């Protein structure tokens, strides 16, 4: 996870405009609609029978916030993703057994969500900066599976 000062600035600048109460819930929700099997890990959230039900599920929106928060922690410690996410890594690998690939999927979904909300502002270079960050969070979380 090596970001040039220029990317660090653009990533920080953009994230400043992110809606911390929504983006996370939208990304988690899209993860469950685009890759249906991920719902298996969240069967206690209630109704996930349809896209609209998933996107409108309170529990999905609430949990999304935490996810975004963690990503935020990461953006504040790109110097030590592995360390920042040591706890989550044990939760997802040792306790939940989520396959490492799903971490990558959620990461790309988030990138899709960001592109959706900022449109033309989410330029090719900015995306590149972000692909690095989500790749780091994922690899850090997969530390107990990698």
């Amino acid at each position: 996870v090596h970001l040039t000062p220029e990317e660090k600035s653009a990533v920080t600048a953009l994230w400043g405009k992110v809606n911390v109460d929504e983006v996370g819930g939208e990304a988690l929700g899209r993860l469950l609609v685009v890759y249906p099997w991920t719902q298996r890990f969240f069967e206690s959230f209630g109704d996930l029978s349809t896209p609209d039900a998933v996107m409108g599920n309170p529990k999905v929106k609430a949990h999304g916030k935490k996810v975004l928060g963690a990503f935020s922690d990461g953006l504040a410690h790109l110097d030590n993703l592995k360390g920042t996410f040591a706890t989550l890594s044990e939760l997802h690998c040792d306790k939940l057994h989520v396959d490492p690939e799903n971490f990558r999927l959620l990461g790309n979904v988030l990138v899709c969500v960001l592109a959706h909300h900022f449109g033309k502002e989410f330029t090719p270079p900015v995306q590149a900066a972000y692909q690095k960050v989500v790749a780091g969070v994922a690899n850090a979380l997969a530390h107990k599976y990698h």
Partner: protein, 141 residues
Amino acid sequence: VLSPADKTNVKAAWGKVGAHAGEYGAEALERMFLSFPTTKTYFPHFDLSHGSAQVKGHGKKVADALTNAVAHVDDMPNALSALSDLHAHKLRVDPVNFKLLSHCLLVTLAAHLPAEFTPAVHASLDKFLASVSTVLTSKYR
């Protein structure tokens, strides 16, 4: 394997790309090239700099191929057979790269067609690109 609804979502969402096809395909390629440098070894002779005329023309070819794939969505293997020979037989592109460009296509679409890029459509487009990728990376000749 696409559902009748996937074909409905894909034909609808792709139809809004229309004349934007060439542009969007070029943007996806560029996004791919910047976000995943590795994908560049496949175009060693190409000028990949921002704004390249080559990248622009190629995306137009990629974009039209996808338009043809959407038309023959129920007959892809026969329809994209030539592209299959190309990517699977001659180029031997590692399947992982197809997930990368697909992701860049989705990102591009999301950034241009916010209203259309709904969860459901997002889901359908992804499966459509994965089916196209399957065909282009399979040797069924």
